[PDB]
Structure 1
């Protein structure tokens, strides 16, 4: 009965095992196991006596690592039934009750082995085991064969989100419940998101060049496969090719076409000349990552991106988390950038501010001034370093005119804007008390940005992001049913009506301005999706340390981000519209494929 995680389309995706207890009948216990316990302590004053009392505890004794009883310890530590354990393994387990942490074979293997051999010696002294049985047993290593009891192989970011969030708020007891957790995750959309992120980050990586082998002269057993990349040891280097040994022991051949892409990385803004020979790319004993084609007939040299990314997709009517990708791959890093990655949103904040200007009486057609402006020592400048004068409000938004934002921020006031940023889902202590907030200086989580944009997609309401649809107990009884705040209660085909944070006119006008952003500049990239219900805003922070895209239709809000964990420039040429927008495009195109137009 483990904690089970299901998508919204009823796919079991994860199984989280907690406290384990597999009761056994005293008669089924191997006599050597009973003797191991009987020789575990120097004195007993309850011999025969301890043997009669052991039956009361043999299925409940806590033995470390969530194991209660002898059968649970055999399963957790060795992937064995009690009858499958060696004398050394029975002695190891019998050593644990006294202190399951001081003698744990995982935490303290030397002290555990010390304890185990002490017991083995006692078994010999008591004549429970022979010198041969003793000699064989003492020689034996720890031989732990621990089965992973946390199954998360289909959609790892989704499964982990449930486990880590339940454990964060309610502790380890949350997993011991045996509950069936029914999430809001769309399995189809989750697979799209995973693939879009992986492809998009590999696209960035390939254009930035070959960064060399991940290791040289190290054991191949020390590297793990993931994101369809297989650890390989370079064994031979030719003119146009190279031979390499896999983890199965086979030798593959990478031809020129599979490595010719390898222009050397110099810096974010420079790659060396196209390689002219295999020797400029690989050395023998180098550890490379390879990827086969669909057939497994050809292999190419690939690279795991150093850059990171994320994707978060929510339903704008209720805040349902439809797809979540926290990084390039869950094995690489368990950290979920959609929920834990604090970054500056850049110009993706501008729609929040421009909505306040619409709220206070302006329209998308209202004339605004794109001119120089100074506030103390601060002289905000546009990306292009040019000024356009009197332009309509919408031109200022689709062209990210910094001076206009700062001017609107003067007109509307910092406090009204900070209060508005909060109502859109941002954090009080993360929003500065100055005029730089108009440019997107606050620290945000991509999930908060999706919360914000949902307001445009749903008619001006604040929704709350949620991942649980319902929880059932092991016996199929519904014990929790999500009661989300709805923007539009009639749209569902009752309960909690979401608060209106913008006038309908303001969410509507902003949604149309954002659709214009897509039907012009970025834009010319996004309109490659043959759909007329899409709106969005690109963003780039100072020196391209972040590339963002936040966009929607009336049924789905997606926020994509690309950047390095330790903030570095992505490269001169790498605006939001270039690095993040492609991921957003592949996701939205496939996610929305075969659904009618859905607008505000």
Structure 2
């Protein structure tokens, strides 16, 4: 009974196997397997009937490491075999594990394991259980691990892993052994859209930054893996306008000029070389490249896995339901989920929060704010363009992200009142400094926390908690957990007990939502959308946080090791296209839904 993961549309997306026990009838056990146990220790005081008799009481229970309880579970976990498919050497390997299933474990100590195994094999021979022929064959046999994957997550990988890693982080490995059916809030259609939007958007950034050369040269093709619809290939012949490449299935393909002409060489983030004029400028024979076929598989193109990373998080602003989550370019690259674990600075993307606090004090979007030079101790917060617009409306100050106005508003609204608000918005106390730079978007945040914050605007001023579990059923069919979330608007559900806490005045949240809608309509065929771009120092991060009354989406683009994305790569350039693509498709065929 594995841990089962479902989307909100009843689709089984992942299965997590825990502690495994496959009981077998004693008479079904190969005699050599019993012999391997009998030879595993020099002396039994319980040729020797008694140990065989007492072995039958433990044979399906013995902890053999790596979640294996009993001989059948070990045969499955280690070799993906039935006990009847095991070789003498593999039987001797398993029989050496009861004593210390870590010291003699073949996964952790392969040397120490073979030492123990060969000793048992030698003893099986001395005891007459095996012939010298069987013995020589078995000692020469390598470890031969064929460990099946028991963590099945090949449909919506980020969504599946979110469940396993969270249960394990909070409740440890026993959470998987439970055999529970976890019904998530994940919308499979929206999840599929998000995965494609992040892939396309990262590839769009990547391509405009240029060809970075083959990922490897003169390395074995078998050491590479396909992912994100990219297939490792080896360059075998280079011509003037085309090249030949060897695939992982042994077939040779040809890439025509049209499939590689895009390859202007990357020089740095703000520079690409001249458009290629010959295939020899792009590839060398023995290069390990990535290719992509078309739908028919009649044509192939030279592609590139982006070095840049990204994420997308989409929540329901009324209850905090996580509808879609993408934590990187592709889950094969690494299990790392940037939506939940990726601490980055939010930049201008934090301003709607602070400005909503100014609106709380009695200001209006039209209220005049002062964009002039300022000082705190010695520090001078300067504007992006080194310009000062003087007295301007609050809404224009926000749209143009004026840093002196922000610092001035922080002084008006007080640091602590803002820190408490950032905390109400979802933000971590420890990650929020007790200084004036917070008005700038200096606190490190998680994209999920930003989504929670933007939901306050979409919902009318309420604090919602992001959640991914709708219900949990036991293996026997009983509902053991039903989500009871805090709702911003209870009448809104029935287009439910817990009412969410109001963290912002209704009028301030509504005003900020409309400023955000005006911002998105001065920088999809929809009129119910609002949003804010963000970019950090030296374009180390590109953000877009936006919403409608039914859905909040936060997109991020950047390198894991903070490096410039490029002079031209503002939040509005790199993150915004991902947001648009997802939102346009996720909201296609839904009526206008404002605050």
| Cα offset, 1:100, TM superposition | 0.7
Q: What residue in structure 1 maps to residue 522 of structure 2?
A: 520
Q: CA deviation at 1:372?
A: 2.1
Tell me the CA shift for residue 233 of structure 1: 1.1
Question: Distance in 1 between the 2:404 and 2:281 partners?
Answer: 49
Partner of 2:572: 577
- Any idea what SS the aligned residue of 1:368 has? strand
Q: Distance in 2 between matches of 1:375 and 1:55?
A: 79
Report the alpha carbon displacement of residue 282 of structure 1 after superposing the two structures with TM: 0.8
Per-residue CA shift, 1:90-143, capped at 9, x if unaligned? 111111111111111111111111111111111111111111111111111111
1:387 Cα offset (Å): 2.1
Greater alpha carbon shift after TM alignment, 388-397 vs 21-30: 388-397
The Cα of 1:415 is off from its aligned counterpart by: 1.4
Q: In structure 1, which of residues 551, 556, 559 is the aligned counterpart of residue 554 of structure 2?
A: 559
Give a deviation string over 1:162-212, Cα, whole Å, max 9, x none.
001100110100000000001110000000000000000000000000111
Aligned equivalents of 2:554 and 2:53: distance in 1?
64
Instruction: Give the alignment of 1:328-367 within 5 angstroms.
Output: 328-367=329-368
Residue 375 of structure 1 deviates from its aligned partner by 2.5
Q: 1:380 and 1:544 mapped to 2: Cα distance?
A: 18
- Measured against aligned partners, the alpha-carbon deviations of 1:406-437 in whole angstroms (never above 9, x if no partner) come to 11112111111111111111111111122211
Paired with 1:332 and 1:292, the residues of 2 have a C-alpha distance of 21
Q: What is the distance in 1 between the residues matched to 2:308 and 2:472?
A: 36
Note the C-alpha offset of 1:444: 0.5
- Measured after TM superposition, the shift of residue 376 of structure 1 is 3.2
Distance 2:574 2:378 in 1: 33
Residue 378 of structure 1: CA displacement? 2.1
The answer on 1:533 being equivalent to 2:528 is: yes
Range moving further from structure 2, 8-17 or 111-120: 111-120
3-state SS of 2:522 partner: helix
Q: How is 1:216-365 mapped onto 2 (pairs within 5 angstroms)? A: 216-365=217-366
* Pairwise CA RMSD: 1.0
Deviates more, 1:370-379 or 1:285-294: 370-379
Q: CA deviation digits over 1:261-291, x for unaligned, max 9?
A: 1111100000100111111111111111111
Secondary structure at 2:24 match in 1: coil
Instruction: Give the match for residue 423 of structure 2.
Output: 422
Cα shift at 1:329: 0.5
In structure 2, the residue matched to 1:495 is 497
- Find the aligned partners of 2:150 and 2:208 in 1 and give their Cα distance: 40
* Alpha-carbon separation, structure 2, partners of 1:35 and 1:50: 11
Structure 2 counterpart SS, 1:557 = strand
Deviation at 1:394, TM superposition (A): 0.9
The runs of at least 4 aligned residues of structure 1 exceeding 3 Å deviation read none
The Cα shift of 1:77 comes to 0.7
Deviation digits for residues 298-333 of structure 1 (CA, Å, limit 9, x no counterpart): 111100000000000000011111100000011102
SS at match of 1:144: coil
SS at match of 1:436: helix
Partner of 2:28: 28
User: Residue by residue, what CA displacement relative to the aligned partner does 1:365-392 show, whole Å, maximum 9, x if unpaired?
Assistant: 1111222223333222222222222221
Q: What is the distance in 2 between the residues matched to 1:164 and 1:43?
A: 44
Moved more, 345-354 or 364-373: 364-373
Could you report, residue by residue, the CA deviation over 1:249-269 in whole angstroms, capped at 9, with x for unpaired residues? 111111111111111110000
- The equivalent of 2:42 in structure 1 is 42
How far apart in 2 are the matches of 1:377 and 1:202? 43
Secondary structure of 1:455's match? helix
What's the CA shift for 1:357? 0.6
Q: How many Å separate the matches in 2 of 1:216 and 1:457? A: 51
- Structure 2 distance, partners of 1:126, 1:487, is 75
Choose 400-409 or 382-391, whichever is displaced more: 382-391
SS in 1 for 2:523: helix
CA distance in structure 2 between the partners assigned to 1:97 and 1:376 by the alignment? 68
SS across alignment from 1:67: coil
Which shifted more, 384-393 or 533-542?
384-393
Classify the secondary structure of the residue corresponding to 1:42.
coil
Structure-2 residue corresponding to 1:124: 125
* C-alpha distance in structure 1 between counterparts of 2:332 and 2:113, whole Å: 30
Paired residues in the alignment total: 593
CA distance in 2, matches of 1:35, 1:196: 58
- 1:225-252 CA-partner distances (Å, limit 9, x unpaired): 1011111111111111111111111111
SS of the aligned residue for 1:344 comes to coil
The aligned runs of 1:443-458 (5 Å cut-off) are: 443-458=444-459
Alpha-carbon distance between aligned partners in 2 of 1:488 and 1:538, rounded to the nearest angstrom: 27
- In the alignment, the residues of structure 2 paired with residue 576 and residue 22 of structure 1 have an alpha-carbon distance, to the nearest angstrom, of 54
Aligned to 1:545: 540
Shift of 1:356: 0.6
Q: TM-score, normalised by structure 1?
A: 0.98
Deviations 1:495-548 (A, max 9, x none): 2111000111011111000000101029xxxxxxx0010000000011100000
- Hey, what does 1:526 align to over in structure 2? none
Alpha-carbon separation, structure 1, partners of 2:411 and 2:52: 83
Shift of 1:29: 0.8
Tell which deviates more after alignment, 194-203 or 285-294: 285-294
Counterpart CA distance in 1 for 2:528 and 2:385 is 30
Provide the C-alpha distance between the structure 2 equivalents of 1:378 and 1:542, rounded to a whole number of angstroms: 17
Give the Å deviation of 1:85: 0.8
Offset, 1:482? 1.1
Matched residues in 1 for 2:306 and 2:429: separation?
34
